Design a protein around this ligand. Sequence first.
Ligand SMILES: [Fe+3]
Length: 202
Amino acid sequence: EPLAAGAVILRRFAFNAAEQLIRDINDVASQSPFRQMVTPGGYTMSVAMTNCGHLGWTTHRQGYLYSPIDPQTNKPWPAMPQSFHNLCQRAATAAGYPDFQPDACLINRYAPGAKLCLHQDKDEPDLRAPIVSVSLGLPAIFQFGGLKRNDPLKRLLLEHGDVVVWGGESRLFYHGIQPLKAGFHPLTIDCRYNLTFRQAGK
DNA sequence: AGGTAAACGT
DNA sequence: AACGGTATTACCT
Ligand SMILES: [Fe+3]
């Protein structure tokens, strides 16, 4: 049974690419460090984040924004690594979205206990493009729901190298991550990373 | 008029 | 601990 209309899980799709992806995460974060962003309402998110590509997702006093500039460094986000772009391209193609051209990659880091409450991806001006989401490291329980927050959730363990793609009918579905269980992974040691690719600009 | 933010109790 | 209230509002543009 497929994940949803327009949505697919490609299990271990990025397994072979994972070590390089992780090297590139570290490179990105060396320029735009992981930070736990503060919501408009004043709470510090449990997931630490950074971005690469032309646009990066950020919070600010007034809301959320995709910005060409990292508000912490006041410099552009690091360029999207070729490994990221290539893996995204292959995954998108395998998932039935051969024309996807991301201009934004949000990198999430989960420590034990870190979570991401249900939310929608809908801040992009062009909602025709899918989201490609790559899991690395420790396993996490991904919630994938529907258009409304109370729509029943599917709960999927996402393991190292799993890639999830949603778009078309499921593009705006709610999704989240349940508090990360402590554990060990040989590549990430004690955390989980996620890469979310988007087309956030024109 | 619409778009926005949302991350405690049971 | 899975589920759902809260934004059922108060502001912007
Ligand atoms: Fe999301």
